[PDB]
C-alpha cells in the first residue's frame, strides 16, 4: 500500500496508461508499487520506471533552477523559502528512487544490462542531489554519484558492446557529471569523445536509441568545445 492491494500486472498496465496521459507522478507511484512486489523488472518495466521518475524529477529540477535563478538575482525570505520547499520535495523523490535501487533492484540484478541500468540510475539520482547540495554532505553526495557511475562503467566495458544504448547513455551522463558537478571539463570532453568514436566503429552490428544518444554526445561536444 498505497499500491500493495493491486496486482503487479495491473500496476504495469496503469503505469503505461499514466504515461499516455502524461501523469508522470501517477506513473512513478505505479512503477514503485510494481518494484515493491519483490520480483525483478523486465527490460520494458525498468524502462517505464526510469522514464516515470526521470520526468517527475525533471519537472522539479526545472522549477528549482527558475527559483534559484530568481533568488541569486534578488541577492524578503519568500524566494528562499519556496526554493527550499521545491528542493526538499526534489530530495524526497531522489531518496525514494535511491531507496528503491538499494532495497530491491541492484541487489537482485544479475545480468549486465540490468546491473548497469540500475547503477546508472543510482549515479543520476545522486547527481540530482549534488545539483542542489551546499552542505557538509555535498562531498559525500558527489562521490556516491561518481562511485555508482564508475561501477556501471566498469561492468558495461567488460560486458556490453560500445554501441549499447545503456552504455552510451551512461557515458553521456557520466560525462555531464564530470563537466558540471566534478568541475572536470577535460575528463567530460575525453569521455564523450572516446564514447562517440568507439560507438561509430561498431555501428556495423545494429539503432534508433543508440543514434539518438550519439547525437546527444555530439551536441554536448559541440556545446563544450
Amino acid at each position: 500500500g498505497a499500491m500493495g492491494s493491486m496486482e503487479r500486472a495491473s500496476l504495469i498496465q496503469k503505469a503505461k496508461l499514466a504515461e499516455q496521459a502524461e501523469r508522470y507522478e501517477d506513473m512513478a507511484a505505479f512503477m514503485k508499487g510494481a518494484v515493491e512486489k519483490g520480483e525483478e523488472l523486465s527490460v520494458e518495466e525498468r524502462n517505464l520506471l526510469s522514464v516515470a521518475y526521470k520526468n517527475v524529477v525533471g519537472g522539479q529540477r526545472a522549477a528549482w533552477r527558475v527559483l534559484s535563478s530568481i533568488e541569486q538575482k534578488s541577492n524578503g525570505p519568500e524566494v528562499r523559502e519556496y526554493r527550499e520547499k521545491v528542493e526538499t520535495e526534489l530530495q524526497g523523490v531522489c531518496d525514494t528512487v535511491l531507496g528503491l535501487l538499494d532495497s530491491h533492484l541492484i541487489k537482485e540484478a544479475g545480468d549486465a544490462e540490468s546491473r548497469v541500468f540500475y547503477l546508472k540510475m543510482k549515479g543520476d539520482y545522486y547527481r540530482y542531489l549534488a545539483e542542489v547540495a551546499t552542505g557538509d554532505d555535498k562531498k559525500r553526495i558527489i562521490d556516491s554519484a561518481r562511485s555508482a557511475y564508475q561501477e556501471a562503467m566498469d561492468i558495461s566495458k567488460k560486458e556490453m558492446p560500445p554501441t549499447h544504448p545503456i552504455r552510451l547513455g551512461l557515458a553521456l551522463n557520466f560525462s555531464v557529471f564530470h563537466y558540471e558537478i566534478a568541475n572536470s571539463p577535460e575528463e567530460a570532453i575525453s569521455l564523450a569523445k572516446t564514447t562517440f568514436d568507439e560507438a561509430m566503429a561498431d555501428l556495423h552490428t545494429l539503432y534508433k536509441d543508440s543514434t539518438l544518444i550519439m547525437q546527444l554526445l555530439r551536441d554536448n561536444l559541440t556545446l563544450w568545445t
Binding site: D124, G169, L172, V176, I213, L216, D219, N220, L223
Partner: peptide, 6 residues
C-alpha cells in the same frame, strides 16, 4: 543552451 543527459 542546455547540455544533454538521458
Amino acid at each position: 543552451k542546455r547540455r544533454k543527459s538521458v
